[PDB]
A and B are shown apart, each in its own frame.
Chain A
Amino acid sequence: QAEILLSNHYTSSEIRVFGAPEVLENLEVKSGSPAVLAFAKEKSFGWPSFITYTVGVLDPAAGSQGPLSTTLTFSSPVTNQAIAIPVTVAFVVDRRG
């Protein structure tokens, strides 16, 4: 996933960060807003090596005040490498406008 969208119909999403096993072992995750979280679901060190993170909203009320866009940064101090993914949160009392 290059960007993430969270809403009434997609309350979470599942992104894989790929890398080398040592870089994935020491992989931090940092959100630009406390209303958006990510947790590690599964690690694979077998090729192609990855970690699936389940990403989701902690508070739908923060997601109701407007389209909350933030970033989710995955970073590994062992290589000083980081990847930052946009996250849009949009929770709606939907119908015709």
Chain B
Amino acid sequence: ATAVSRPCAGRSRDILWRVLGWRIVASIVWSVLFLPICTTVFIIFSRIDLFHPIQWLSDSFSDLYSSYVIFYFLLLSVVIIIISIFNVEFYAVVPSIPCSRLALIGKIIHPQQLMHSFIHAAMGMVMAWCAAVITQGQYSFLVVPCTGTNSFGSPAAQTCLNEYHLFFLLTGAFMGYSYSLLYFVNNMNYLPFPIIQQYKFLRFRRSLLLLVKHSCVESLFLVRNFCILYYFLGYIPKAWISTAMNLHIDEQVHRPLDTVSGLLNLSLLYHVWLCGVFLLTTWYVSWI
């Protein structure tokens, strides 16, 4: 039992796969084919020095061909494939307009639009993890050995929670949630057809320059909003993760990011903004 009596619920979708299936596959392939152009640009913008520009370019290529960047590129291509697939669940041919404020709240609280904001928060956290390992140094890992424990007693290598890697991951989660919220609030999922059809290369060469300008401004607003959110809540994920893994805090080497005199660090703010520009640009390239 029981495969009978519903052949039209094939045929109605099967014509949709004749007409649209190869258009979806070509869109997914092009979304992955732009990812190397986004990761090269992300490394070249995170490696910037202004005094030794020949070494800046040298060592950006030294990372680019490194086996860890090749692995995280393969993880990031799976993330971009999955984001391209969720644009195939959530698209609309008619805009889902809320005729009251309660209708807008009821749209945001709809269980699939909630599922999409949880899944985008997870994909944003994974993309921020890949980005934090690609930026190396103090960003590289969630756990670091205690940086001052010269107190002879206990040859156990004690471990601290990396609050800057936690800030990276949690910004990624907030950006992914915010993108998915914006996607349904602005009706970005709507497919307005063009009054003027145009060859794909021109139709993309005209939009990409508007997108990179949008990503730079929207990442700056999302980092600004996340900095205000962390100043009132950062301690809660921090104290939960330190207790859940029995990790310490190096209050002698690192200033905590609950403090304005740690959180205003321009290097962290730039690398987290650049991560948000890579995130928004790759996700909006799949959408475009």
Q: Identify the A interface with B (CB < 8 A).
A: 3, 65-71, 86, 88-90
Would you give 20 A-B contacts (Cβ < 8 Å), ordered by A? A3-B155, A65-B246, A66-B157, A66-B158, A66-B246, A67-B155, A67-B156, A67-B157, A67-B158, A69-B153, A69-B154, A69-B155, A69-B156, A71-B153, A86-B153, A86-B154, A88-B155, A88-B156, A89-B156, A90-B156
Residue pairs across A and B with CB atoms within 8 Å: the count is: 25
Tell me the smallest distance from the CB of A82 to a CB of chain B, in Å.
16
Q: How far is the CA of A90 from the CA of B159 in the complex (A)?
A: 13
Query: B residues within 8 A CB of A66?
Result: 156-159, 246
Tell me the smallest distance from the CB of B152 to a CB of chain A, in Å.
9
Q: Name A86's closest neighbour in chain B (CB-CB).
A: B155
Q: How far is the CA of A68 from the CA of B158 in the complex (A)?
A: 9
Q: Name A5's closest neighbour in chain B (CB-CB).
A: B155
Query: A residues within 8 A CB of B157?
Result: 66-67
Q: How far is the CA of A19 from the CA of B155 in the complex (A)?
A: 27
Q: Name B141's closest neighbour in chain A (CB-CB).
A: A97
Over the window 109-141 of chain B, the binary record of Cβ atoms lying under 8 Å from chain A Cβ atoms (1 yes, 0 no) is: 000000000000000000000000000000000
Query: B residues within 8 A CB of A88?
Result: 155-156
Query: B residues within 8 A CB of A86?
Result: 153-155
Report which residue of B153, B156, B157, B246 has the largest number of chain A beta carbons within 10 angstroms of its beta carbon: B156
Tell me the smallest distance from the CB of B170 to a CB of chain A, in Å.
24
Tell me the smallest distance from the CB of B162 to a CB of chain A, in Å.
15
Q: Name A89's closest neighbour in chain B (CB-CB).
A: B156
Query: B residues within 8 A CB of A67?
Result: 155-158
